[PDB]
Ligand binder design. Structure first.
Ligand SMILES: [Zn+2]
Ligand SMILES: [Zn+2]
Ligand SMILES: [Zn+2]
Lengths: 52, 604, 380, 54, 154
DNA sequence: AGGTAGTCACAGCTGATTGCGCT
DNA sequence: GCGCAATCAGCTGTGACTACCT
């Protein structure tokens, strides 16, 4: 059901590599990017499905 | 020699760092070469090192090569002399050659041309310039069985004697242990005994400069020597073989792996050699286009080495084939030559030059060393990074995206250990969702997708769930051919599934996306071949593995060949927009239902 | 024999040593050999040009619904047409583009022949969602193009581009008579098909002097359009071709001055949307009409309004910069400081201009020959 | 033999539903040690649970 | 193609048994055999299936959707005049021949020499321009060998 | 106290049998 | 009744898991 969908999503999308990555992001830069060069390099090195 | 930090330090061994850093090279005492790519003399140093040593890794900045006895044999086979190579290595050292390499190089290069093997009148002979070496090897027990009947003196002219044809592999293995390696030189310019054919490639099939270098190294002083050329599948590999066959100008025999590769080679010959169909023959027990009296013959393995009863027509064809010399016997997918029955194939036919072609020279069981004497030395090793920098090879963006194990599956994975856990991490629901998301995304962006998946039992429910074409493998010949033929030129269908069938050199069309799930354990050859099916960021391929399982270790240990080739595997841990759309196994009910059907094997 | 069956090339034989350390100097030459990899020409092809009145004919039949090019032929065709219009107006200052759409055995002039780039792009974007019906009629589109281009001056190069998707055309009359009429009228017709070669298109292109091509894929489509972008070569001196055109100054209006008169743009008055009531814009030198875009021909007095920098951007082709004489540093007896960058001259070669006899380093010589296109010394 | 083997296991593997035994510890009466300590022993696997009860 | 049947059809002693296959820079022909249609039913022209509606519909669909990919003329051959006329009558009865009509013109070869000549002339003139046409004939007819379809024709 | 021939999975090949089609 | 294509038996390659002697 609707509750089962939410439970499965919570179990899957955040099982191992989110319980620390999300916490680090909450304790991260937060503000704007360092330079525009970093953003361009990140966009170049990111996959097409990660830029949408 | 010292182990202060566990690292072999050679600071005192090679202090010749005169002035000052202009030589982009480092030598090792035991043996190793480190080359700096960011040098103005990079191309010349690379050309010098290729002709003398084989690479061990080619990253973007600091290449590493290895010095081996066979590499030095190949170097001295070309017009390069001992003095030239020694003085040029000393020229670009920046540290001074240690006094363990010069002695090693001298010892390797001294005994190169002392012993030669020749074929004449369907007879194998071993000829030596120095008569003493014959008496040196006379006391060897293994050699004495080759002569029959004992070959009392075989007085000719230069001392030579006959050897047993079927025991040539044994003497080839023994000679290198005796520090007298054999050389396979075919001086096809002047034979006057062998009936050369009128093959001549059309003057319209241009070849790239690296193919020019490989062919030029093949024919160094007007003669052809047996060797191995390693080129990517997407790059021009059949063209090199066709050009070599045309240059040899003799009766050619081509050996493939599958029953469809022979058609591929026939098409390549008809495209780039201008040969009449009467001379071209294929001997694979399908049409039998009169192989008797032919110029070029194409066949496959597992047919020339049958240990069982053979067909009547095939028996006569083999009897005819084993009664004449062959020019430039070409082997395809040479990596799987060192087998129980494939090794004897070279001993069942007689040929002057044996040219092996492959894309993935890596193999387990450390049997590649045997290939050094089975055929010859590793002649050319193409640099994949610079090959894709020129734009002629698609720059594939490698990805290693893993998925967590679902709770309903990890308990069973840790519960069972007797080979029953393969299906558990093979059919991971999270991996299934990731694969489905990738399929949908790359279909929305209109990219051809090839999904490799071993363990076809899992592939059944993996493919029928999405209702997409798949190749079980033991289906038929027409169905696979028609599926692969309509895969390319059809906008409606642009994704196919292959189960260990595409792990060889086939005619698969151009694709941009490859997704491999649950392949073999540590088959670097298989992963390299699968990667080769994509290149021909134009393209990119993904590998899906399950965390906290043996598949992680398998993926880690199978990608080392590609990182040696220069590729980098980016790790993807989150998929953007995974929850944006609906995917299969959304709820836990079907996930836990999957356990029963995945444990329903019970192969006991 | 074969080239590769002879002697193996030893490329490493180039480097040599005489003092046990001279190799560095050799690689320095390699560094000097690294530069000057260009021909000192950004284009290197046609050094002149000629005005073009190009017509683009777009098929609107059911064949445009085919999904050979994602999503369909019409969408990719219109996207590449927008790109082609942008590039064509970028590389041609005083050219004109008209658009005709063929549909249901009829031809409709989607956009009049003009030099405005924005109008054509908007028309194409509107036409993206058109309905594909009927079959194309090359005869009607060619007749309309010939009728419009018949009265154009002879010095202008009259060109018609046809994007023929469907393989069949309905001709109300004989088309070869129309082809002969076009040949007598000196009209260049080029066709870029999508499915396969058609005999009538090949005959038309061959007889009218144009080029006929067939699309292999989207990349080949873009390459063909880019090839069509380049203007045709022109004679050294053909006729008395001159055209009266103005140069409107971009005068903005500020409330600080008392001469700030708000005015509606003449071009914006013709649109369905509310015309922009801006402070100011481009004023016609003849009738003081207000416009917001350039180059736009004036609707009132008929004068053409062209931006001077666009015309001046191609003047360097008329007066190419002569190559400087390469002189070794030792053989030059003079100052060792570059005239352009004031840097010390340490390279093995120093370039001296033939007019002002000034010294320029490798970097300054490359910069002058590639971008500046004028010798700084000769300017003074 | 093959065509009967391929179907003999179809009904064999369709009967069992639960493979893992229920591990729910059904502790019996609590045993009282010193310092108000209480121990519970599982009647299924012999698991011992010692706790302090307020 | 069969060099073993002519020496035995008529008294002959061949000493050649030679065949030649032309080659060019590219494959100039793409022969292919189309079996079952989109309904997975064979389109064989068997005598027991000459009047079958399914094979007639499949032939009509093949001729229709084929006529939109190959331009400027298609030459189609039928087994016999009777079968050809029955098939075109069946296509006329259905609303399928009209779809072929708007793509290419339909021309029918008959036994009349003058009619055949004028039909060939109008087919040639229709293929000269972009209208395109279909020439329907029989394999065993005087038009089969009397003319050669040079490039851009058929 | 530490290592290799059987065994299993999944593919390939060729050598016969073996039911299916008939203007 | 004959002929072509589908089918299986037997052997082999590749990679990995497992039970007794220096
Ligand atoms: Zn005006
Ligand atoms: Zn300067
Ligand atoms: Zn000057």
């Amino acid at each position: 059901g609707t509750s089962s969908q939410a439970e499965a999503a919570r179990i899957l999308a955040a099982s191992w590599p989110q319980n620390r990555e999300d916490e680090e992001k909450q304790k991260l830069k937060g503000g704007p990017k360092k330079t525009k060069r970093e953003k361009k390099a990140a966009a170049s090195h990111l996959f097409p499905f990660e830029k949408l | 020699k010292v182990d202060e930090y566990g690292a072999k330090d050679y600071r005192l061994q090679m202090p010749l760092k005169d002035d000052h850093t202009s030589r982009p090279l480092w030598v090792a005492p035991d043996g190793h070469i480190f080359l700096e790519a960011f040098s103005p003399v990079y191309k010349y140093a690379q050309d010098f090192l290729v002709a003398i040593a084989e690479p061990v890794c080619r990253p973007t900045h600091v290449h590493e090569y290895k010095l081996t006895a066979y590499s030095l044999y190949a170097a001295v086979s070309v017009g390069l002399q001992t003095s030239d190579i020694t003085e040029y290595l000393r020229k670009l050292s920046k540290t001074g050659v240690p006094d363990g390499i010069m002695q090693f190089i001298k010892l390797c290069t001294v005994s190169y041309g002392k012993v030669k093997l020749v074929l004449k009148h369907n007879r194998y002979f071993v000829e030596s310039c120095h008569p003493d070496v014959i008496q040196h090897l006379l006391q060897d027990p293994v050699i004495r069985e080759c002569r029959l009947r004992n070959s009392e003196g075989e007085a000719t002219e230069t001392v030579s004697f006959e050897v047993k044809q079927e025991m040539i592999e044994e003497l080839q293995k023994r000679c290198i242990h005796l520090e007298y390696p054999l050389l396979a030189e075919y001086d096809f310019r002047n034979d006057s005994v062998n009936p050369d054919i009128n093959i001549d490639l059309k003057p319209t099939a241009v070849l790239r400069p690296y193919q020019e270098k490989s062919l030029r190294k093949m024919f160094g002083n007007g003669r052809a020597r047996s060797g191995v050329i390693v080129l990517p599948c997407g790059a021009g590999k059949s063209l090199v073989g066709v050009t070599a066959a045309c240059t040899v100008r003799k009766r050619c025999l081509v050996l493939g792996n599958s029953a469809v590769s022979v058609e591929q080679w026939k098409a390549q010959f008809k495209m780039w050699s201008t040969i009449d169909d009467s001379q071209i023959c294929r001997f694979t027990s399908d049409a039998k286009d009169k192989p008797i009296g032919c110029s070029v013959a194409i066949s496959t393995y597992s047919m020339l080495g049958h240990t069982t009863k053979r067909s009547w027509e095939a028996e006569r064809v083999m009897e005819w084939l084993k009664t004449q010399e062959w020019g430039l016997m070409i082997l395809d997918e040479v990596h799987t030559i060192p087998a129980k029955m494939f090794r004897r194939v070279l001993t069942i036919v007689q040929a002057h030059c044996k040219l092996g072609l492959t894309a993935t020279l890596v193999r387990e069981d450390d049997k590649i060393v045997d290939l050094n004497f089975l055929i010859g030395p590793k002649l050319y090793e193409a640099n994949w990074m610079e090959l894709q920098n020129n734009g002629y090879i698609a720059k594939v963006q490698c990805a290693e995206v893993w998925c967590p194990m679902s709770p309903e599956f990890y308990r069973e994975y840790v519960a069972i250990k007797t080979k029953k856990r393969i299906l558990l991490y093979t059919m991971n629901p999270n991996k299934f969702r990731a694969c489905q998301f990738l399929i949908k995304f790359h279909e929305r962006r209109n990219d051809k997708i090839i999904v490799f998946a071993d363990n076809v039992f899992a592939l059944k429910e993996y493919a029928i769930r999405l209702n997409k074409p798949y190749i079980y493998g033991p289906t038929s010949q027409g169905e696979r051919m028609q599926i692969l033929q309509n895969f390319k030129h059809n906008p409606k269908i642009n994704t196919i599934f292959i189960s260990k069938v595409g792990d060889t050199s086939f005619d698969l069309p151009e694709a941009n996306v490859l997704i491999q799930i649950s392949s073999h354990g540590g088959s670097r050859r298989q992963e390299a071949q699968r990667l080769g099916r994509v290149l021909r960021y134009n393209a990119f391929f993904y590998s899906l593995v399950s965390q906290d399982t043996q598949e992680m270790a398998y993926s880690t240990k199978r990608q080392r060949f590609l990182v040696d080739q220069g590729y980098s595997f980016k790790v993807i841990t989150k998929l953007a927009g995974m929850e944006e759309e609906d995917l299969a196994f959304s709820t836990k009910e079907e996930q836990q239902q999957l356990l029963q059907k995945v444990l329903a094997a019970t192969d006991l | 024999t074969k080239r590769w069956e002879g002697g193996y090339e030893r490329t490493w034989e180039i480097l040599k040593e005489d003092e046990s350390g001279s190799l560095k100097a050799t690689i320095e030459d390699i560094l000097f050999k690294a530069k000057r990899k260009r021909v000192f020409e950004h284009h290197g092809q046609v050094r002149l040009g000629m005005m073009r009145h190009l017509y683009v004919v777009v098929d609107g039949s059911r064949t445009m619904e085919d999904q050979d090019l994602k999503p369909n032929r019409l969408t990719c065709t219109l996207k590449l047409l927008e790109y082609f219009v942008e590039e064509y107006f970028d590389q041609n200052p005083i050219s004109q583009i008209g658009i005709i759409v063929t549909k249901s055995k009829r031809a409709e002039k989607l956009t009049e022949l003009s030099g405005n780039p924005r109008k054509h792009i908007t028309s194409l974007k509107k036409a993206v969602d058109m309905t594909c019906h009927g079959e194309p009629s090359l005869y009607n589109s060619l007749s309309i193009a010939m009728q419009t281009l018949k009265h154009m001056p002879g010095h202008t190069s009259r060109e018609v581009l046809i994007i023929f998707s469907s393989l069949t055309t309905c001709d109300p009359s004989n088309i070869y008579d129309l082809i002969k009429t076009l040949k007598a009228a000196k009209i260049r017709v080029s066709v870029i098909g999508l499915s396969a070669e058609v005999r009538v298109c090949t005959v038309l292109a061959r007889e009218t002097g144009g080029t006929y091509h067939v699309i292999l894929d989207e990349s080949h489509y873009k390459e063909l359009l880019t090839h069509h972008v380049s203007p045709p070569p022109a004679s050294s001196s053909s006729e008395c071709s001159l055209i009266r055109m103005g140069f409107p100054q971009h005068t903005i209006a500020s409330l600080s001055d008392q001469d700030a008169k708000p005015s509606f743009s003449m071009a914006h008055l013709d649109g369905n949307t509310e015309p922009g009531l801006t402070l100011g814009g481009y004023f016609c030198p003849q009738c003081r009409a207000k416009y917001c875009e350039l180059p736009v021909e004036c609707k009132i007095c008929g004068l053409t309004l062209v931006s001077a920098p666009h015309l001046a951007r191609s003047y360097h082709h008329l007066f190419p910069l002569d190559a400087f004489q390469e002189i070794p540093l030792e053989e030059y007896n003079g100052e060792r400081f570059c005239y352009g960058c004031q840097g010390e001259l340490k390279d093995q070669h120093v370039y001296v201009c033939a007019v002002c006899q000034n010294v320029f380093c490798v970097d300054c010589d490359v910069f002058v020959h590639d971008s500046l296109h004028c010798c700084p010394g000769c300017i003074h | 033999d093959k065509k009967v083997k391929e179907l003999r296991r179809a009904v064999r593997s369709s009967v069992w539903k639960r493979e893992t035994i229920v591990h729910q510890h059904e502790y019996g009466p609590e045993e009282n040690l010193e310092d108000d300590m209480y121990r519970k022993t599982c009647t299924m696997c012999g698991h011992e649970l010692t706790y302090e009860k307020m | 193609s069969p060099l073993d049947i002519y020496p035995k059809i008529l008294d002959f002693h061949p000493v050649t048994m030679a065949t030649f296959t032309m080659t060019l820079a590219r494959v100039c022909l793409c022969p292919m055999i189309i079996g079952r249609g989109n309904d997975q039913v064979a389109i064989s022209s068997k005598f027991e299936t000459r009047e079958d509606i399914a094979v007639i519909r499949n032939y009509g669909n093949l001729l229709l959707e084929m006529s939109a990919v190959v331009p400027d003329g298609i030459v189609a051959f039928f087994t016999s005049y009777q079968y050809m006329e029955s098939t075109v009558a069946s296509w006329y009865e259905q609303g399928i021949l009209e779809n072929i009509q708007r793509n290419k013109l339909l021309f029918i070869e008959t036994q009349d020499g003058a009619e055949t000549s004028v039909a060939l002339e109008k087919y040639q003139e229709a293929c000269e321009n972009g209208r395109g046409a279909i020439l329907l004939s029989v394999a065993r007819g005087k038009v089969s060998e009397g003319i050669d379809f040079v490039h851009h024709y058929g």
